[PDB]
Paper text:
EPAC1, a cAMP-activated GEF for Rap GTPases, is a major transducer of cAMP signaling and a therapeutic target in cardiac diseases. EPAC1 has the same domain organization as EPAC2, apart from the replacement of the first CNB domain by a 50-residue domain without recognizable structural homology, suggesting that its mechanism of autoinhibition release shares common features with that of EPAC2. We find that anionic membranes activate EPAC1 independently of cAMP, increase its affinity for cAMP by two orders of magnitude, and synergize with cAMP to yield maximal GEF activity.
The structure shows that the DEP and CNB domains are connected by a kinked helix (residues 154–181, with the kink located at P171), which is sandwiched between the two domains and entirely mediates their interaction. The potential to form hydrogen bonds at this residue likely contributes to the distinct selectivities of EPAC1 and EPAC2 for cAMP-derived agonists. The structure confirms that it lacks a positively charged pocket that could accommodate PS or PIP2 headgroups, such as the phosphoinositide-binding pocket of PH domains. Combining our EPAC1DEP-CNB structure to a model of EPAC1CNB-GEF/Rap1, we then built a composite model of cAMP-activated EPAC1DEP-CNB-GEF bound to Rap1 and used it to examine how EPAC1 binds to anionic membranes. We identified an extended cationic tract at the surface in the EPAC1DEP-CNB-GEF model, comprised of the polybasic loop in the DEP domain (residues 75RDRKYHLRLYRQ86), and numerous lysines and arginines in the CNB and GEF domains.
Residue numbers in the entry: 50 to 101, 105 to 150, 157 to 305
């Protein structure tokens, strides 16, 4: 969690919006509903652009603020909406009025693409827009484990790929001898490969994959997979999809 810096970055941005867009955060009436001291997502993005390269970048910045609590949706939704009908508030107490803004924009922009990729991934398979599938596809272009596959194939994987986050190191993902149900790509983190006979046989890092032996050979898992770091993030492909798309 880099939550503390996002917050102060958000706090820093929040100060320059009130100064540059004095009527961005106001009372609003939508469908005869009244929302106090809020802004629309679409106008929030607009205002961030007005400060002074792309809209998708700014959308990523907003997603990052929503994620770290530096921005909160009126209707408690987790995907940021670049829309007129969606309203957001800054939280925390009012900050003091107004290079620090520059580095606050950079820190937020650095995390934007991942924030937007996570939203696409958190969308269950079959409920992904072409734009979300577009984001997941471009990510597979950066994964060593699938580089030898065709774009058509990567596209198929994007359609069925499953997002599987974890938090604690030392978690046993599956054990030697278990029925093999799924293929795994390491988006973030690393894992230990442990066999009963030799102990730690190897370490896999971001961009590697594991768990195909059990699917390809119709056999029990040949090793225990243990999370080596905090916050491992996996892309998972279930057996049926793996077999249909990789056999
Ligand atoms: N030396 C190794 N022995 C066995 N499995 C390994 C080894 N190195 C990496 N692996 C991976 O560990 C996985 C454990 O489950 P699988 O047998 O399905 O697929 C295996 C491989 O992807």
């Amino acid at each position: 969690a880099s939550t503390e810096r996002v917050l102060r970055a958000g706090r820093q941005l929040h100060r320059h919006l009130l100064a540059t867009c004095p009527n961005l955060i106001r009372d609003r009436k939508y469908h005869l509903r009244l929302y106090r001291q809020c802004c629309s997502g679409r106008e929030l993005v607009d205002g961030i652009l007005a400060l002074g390269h792309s809209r998708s970048q700014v959308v990523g910045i907003c997603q990052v603020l929503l994620d770290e609590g530096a921005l909160c949706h009126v209707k408690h939704d987790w995907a940021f909406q670049d829309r007129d009908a969606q309203f957001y508030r800054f939280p925390g107490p009012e900050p003091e009025p107004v290079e620090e803004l520059a580095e606050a924009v950079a820190l937020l922009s650095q995390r934007g693409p991942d924030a937007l990729l996570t939203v696409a991934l958190r969308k269950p398979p079959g409920q992904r827009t072409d734009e979300e599938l577009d984001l997941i596809f471009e990510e597979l272009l950066h994964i060593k484990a699938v580089a030898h596959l065709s774009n058509s194939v990567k596209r198929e994987l994007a359609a069925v790929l499953l997002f599987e986050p974890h938090s604690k190191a030392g978690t046993v993902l599956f054990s030697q001898g278990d029925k093999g149900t799924s293929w795994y790509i390491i988006w973030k983190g690393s894992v230990n490969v442990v066999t009963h006979g030799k102990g730690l046989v190897t370490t896999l890092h971001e961009g590697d994959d594991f768990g195909q032996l059990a699917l390809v050979n119709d056999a029990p898992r040949a090793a225990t997979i243990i999370l080596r770091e905090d916050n491992c993030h996996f892309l998972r492909v279930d057996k049926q999809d793996f077999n249909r798309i990789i056999k």
